[PDB]
Amino acid sequence: VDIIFRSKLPDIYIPNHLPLHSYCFENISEFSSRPCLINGANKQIYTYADVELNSRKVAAGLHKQGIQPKDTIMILLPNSPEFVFAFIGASYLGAISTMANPLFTPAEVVKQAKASSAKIIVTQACHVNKVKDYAFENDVKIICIDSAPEGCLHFSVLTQANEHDIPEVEIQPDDVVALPYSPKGVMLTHKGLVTSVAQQVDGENPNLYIHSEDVMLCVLPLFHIYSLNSVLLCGLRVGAAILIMQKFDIVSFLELIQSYKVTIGPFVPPIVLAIAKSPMVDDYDLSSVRTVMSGAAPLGKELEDTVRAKFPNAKLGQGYGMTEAGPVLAMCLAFAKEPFEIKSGACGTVVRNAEMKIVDPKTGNSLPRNQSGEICIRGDQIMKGYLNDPEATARTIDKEGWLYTGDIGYIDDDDELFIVDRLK
Ligand SMILES: [Ca+2]
Ligand SMILES: [Ca+2]
């Protein structure tokens, strides 16, 4: 009988026996013809029908390239449609996507490629130098999304494959599907990610209310779990438009927000500082943005004031995330369909269908409200473990299923989480 905390919302039914793709597209028929991915640079629009078909084609293509269930591909791509097709294609096969920052060094990319046992690297022509001769010696294929160099395949060999050549497969809930690194490979499963997505956007009163006429700006990098999950996956679930920006600069960012009337803005302190200093911000209609969320460190008081002055209809709020946790441990309840009050400085309320407690690090004993200790969470959304490192897993998830974040915070009288130390 510890002191356990739960969400202010009720639990919901979570269909986490479904594979990730079957869950994200479960309600595709309600929005088959709506915009799904919008490429900000060239304005190309893929509907939900196109996105699913493209992902299944990519899956058959990966199959023809020798990817079997539980094999791993690496995505070394900026935000782009191809990132999505690769990621979802690997999921259709029951295979694993490890994603990496394309601006990594050769030594960085290669170390992740070998720890993850990646059979294919999907990349841009301009980055092939970093891996081309590593790939060569270890029979790892290279596929480029813009143009193949001598010894690589062009991504059309996947996107043009026959969708009905996807092999019959028996995906299990605990099968790994996503392997971001944090450096340790964090094994996220179909069950985890479906749970995490449902805890965020499903239910009669969703913790984060998004619907199929929203436009979500996808400028935060998809190779970080924060956006992979809370923008792409959640957006797919509810049928929203995912307006992809491949790299941030302030002008096209304001341009895309006005022209596409972005309603959901996943920002980070470096973005709001660009907004603060850019003279041209006052020359754009940004009234479409109704929800702004932080994906990294908290904005602070000045940056929060910038968002309130430049985005007049934007609700502002802070969550709390960690890669091993799914990533989302807590969500801002001001974003709920039927909103709750919040408080400056708070990092949200623990997700529904989960338990949280605060563990004094000397004792090991759960703490009351308004006292600081290590944040711990438990639920189906958390990782399965670190890849090939059972010991580091055993020090991070205990025997009762509790994940120890290493962050110090407390929960106050209104079930609002406050974090006081993130430096481990
Ligand atoms: Ca065909
Ligand atoms: Ca199954």
Swiss-Prot record:
Taxonomic path: Eukaryota, Viridiplantae, Streptophyta, Embryophyta, Tracheophyta
Presence of keyword Phosphoprotein: no
UniProt name for this protein: 4-coumarate--CoA ligase 2
List of residues binding (E)-feruloyl-AMP: 226, 230, 296, 319, 323, 331, 407, 422, 424
Reactions catalysed, as given in the entry: (E)-4-coumarate + ATP + CoA = (E)-4-coumaroyl-CoA + AMP + diphosphate; (E)-caffeate + ATP + CoA = (E)-caffeoyl-CoA + AMP + diphosphate; (E)-ferulate + ATP + CoA = (E)-feruloyl-CoA + AMP + diphosphate; (E)-cinnamate + ATP + CoA = (E)-cinnamoyl-CoA + AMP + diphosphate
Binding site for (E)-caffeoyl-AMP: 226, 230, 296, 319, 323, 331, 407, 422, 424
Binding site for AMP: 319, 323, 407, 424
EC top class, as a word: ligase
Native source organism of the sequence: Nicotiana tabacum
Domain comment in the entry: Both substrate-binding domains (SBD1 and SBD2) are involved in the substrate recognition, and are sufficient to confer the substrate specificity.
Function: Major enzyme of the phenylpropanoid pathway that mediates the production of several precursors for numerous metabolites and regulates carbon flow. Catalyzes the formation of CoA thioesters using 4-coumarate, ferulate, caffeate, and cinnamate as substrates. Follows a two-step reaction mechanism, wherein a (hydroxy)cinnamate substrate first undergoes adenylation by ATP leading to an acyl-AMP, followed by a thioesterification in the presence of CoA to yield the final (hydroxy)cinnamoyl-CoA product. Almost inactive toward sinapate.
Induction remark: Induced by wounding and methyl jasmonate (MeJA).
Keyword Nucleotide-binding: yes
Region: SBD2, residue numbers: 319-386
GO BP terms, alphabetized: phenylpropanoid metabolic process; response to jasmonic acid; response to wounding
